[PDB]
Design a binder for these strands. Structure first.
Ligand SMILES: [Mg+2]
Ligand SMILES: [Mg+2]
Ligand SMILES: [Zn+2]
Ligand SMILES: [Zn+2]
Ligand SMILES: [Zn+2]
Ligand SMILES: [Zn+2]
Lengths: 162, 162
DNA sequence: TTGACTCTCTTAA
DNA sequence: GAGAGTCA
DNA sequence: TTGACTCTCTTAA
DNA sequence: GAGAGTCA
């Protein structure tokens, strides 16, 4: 809604409902050959999802609340950050999953940062493998690794230098 | 269609033209506090770009050659890799700039890999900062660093546990 | 055969 | 990663 | 009011 | 990060 008290009330009912999502334990790589344990509060795969929740995409959901007879709606992972600036350096703030588990709505697994910072975590070495993120990663990104490059830098002639 | 010999001729004419693009010397971070030097062969900001080159987008260009009366066209950074597999692990191969300079067409600054591998380089610590890419980075990714997270994981109540 | 424009599409966040 | 509309 | 669906859009590779 | 069309 508009007031601070109204925003807090939305965050509180959101936390309460998400707090009832089935909790799944996920064992994850932390980097440095170590492994950790995360507890994700996962939104159901099909309706009903929970009071105020509806799916707008294969892995997109929205939280809806009627305040003064007028309905307000937000991306499902954005609610915890309603009181924070919605941009940083002219870039939109986005819900970033430290657990890299889209269905998870655990606010302890979420941060609010630019889409670039958000995507970048996919390749982070992890909390025990060299992560330098100021708001630290909970695990090594799923895409961290040597890659699978088909062909590297090369030239046929002698017109170029590195 | 085009024989291997014909493709080689296209790569050679491409190298010849790009070789004449302004060569710009850039001082870049390599990771681990070290600075390096990269020499980029940059396509002009406006027409004419060079023989065979035309702009199809703000920072997208194509290379075109007519052989035996049939017109052939390729993404401008894809020519060096015309004789390589065009997919890997079921993913389309894409032109990845080891120099992170879009206008650059120096083949010694390009590699051929999946879009995920491609993007991930934006956050790499660099060849002197811990890069683990099998086809090593030439520099530290422009987006590597602490990031600028606005708000971290948090909860108002006690419904959650990490 | 070529140059200089036009257009829409792909991926995963 | 987001926005909003259509029905019941 | 609340739920369960539908659509298209943004970003930067 | 891409493929393809128009026009002279
Ligand atoms: Mg994410
Ligand atoms: Mg790139
Ligand atoms: Zn989680
Ligand atoms: Zn990290
Ligand atoms: Zn370059
Ligand atoms: Zn690297």
């Amino acid at each position: 809604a508009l007031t601070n008290a109204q925003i807090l009330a939305v965050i509180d009912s959101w936390e309460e409902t998400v707090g009832q999502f089935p909790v799944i334990t996920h064992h994850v790589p932390l980097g440095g050959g170590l492994q950790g344990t995360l507890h994700c509060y996962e939104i159901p795969l099909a309706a009903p999802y929970g009071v105020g929740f509806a799916k707008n995409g294969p892995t997109r959901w929205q939280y809806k609340r009627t305040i003064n007879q007028v309905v307000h709606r937000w991306g499902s992972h954005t609610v915890p950050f309603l009181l924070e600036p919605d941009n940083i350096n002219g870039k939109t703030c986005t819900a970033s999953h430290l657990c890299h588990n889209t269905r998870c709505h655990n606010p302890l697994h979420l941060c609010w940062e630019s889409l670039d910072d958000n995507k970048g975590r996919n390749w982070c070495p992890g909390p025990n493998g060299g992560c330098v993120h100021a708001v630290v990663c909970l695990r090594q990104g799923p895409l961290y690794g040597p890659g699978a490059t088909v062909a590297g830098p090369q030239q046929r002639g002698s017109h170029f230098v590195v």
